[PDB]
Ligand binder design. Structure first.
Ligand SMILES: *[C@@H]1O[C@H](CO)[C@@H](O)[C@H](O)[C@H]1NC(C)=O
Lengths: 50, 49
């Protein structure tokens, strides 16, 4: 005869809300890996991809 | 769950602590079961309570 504080072992389905920014256009991956002229190891190029 | 019954032991210890606190309050305040009322007229020899 008493009161006991216990845990929970139930499961529930998943409802999700996805918020992704306004973006439409591709970004160049097919030309940085396909470029004929590649930089040397001291003077490696650095390209910001956005 | 690979670790075992740590969480149950900690919950049992905390529940025992809470029950002990309630027991301390009950044993320090419920000394008498008769709830006496103050008299409506107060003339205790000039003492002001
Ligand atoms: C490089 O070009 C070829 C065809 O010209 C293409 O199939 C490949 O996907 C390109 N590389 C990348 C990283 O997209």
């Amino acid at each position: 005869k008493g009161i006991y504080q216990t845990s929970n072992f139930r499961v529930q389905p998943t409802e999700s809300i996805v918020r992704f920014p306004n973006i439409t256009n591709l970004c160049p991956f097919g030309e940085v890996f396909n470029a004929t002229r590649f930089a040397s190891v001291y003077a490696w190029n650095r390209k910001r991809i956005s | 769950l690979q670790y075992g019954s740590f969480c149950t032991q900690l919950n049992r210890a905390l529940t025992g602590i809470a029950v002990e606190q309630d027991k301390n309050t009950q044993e320090v305040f419920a000394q008498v079961k008769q709830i006496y009322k103050t008299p409506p007229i107060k003339d205790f020899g000039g003492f002001n309570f």
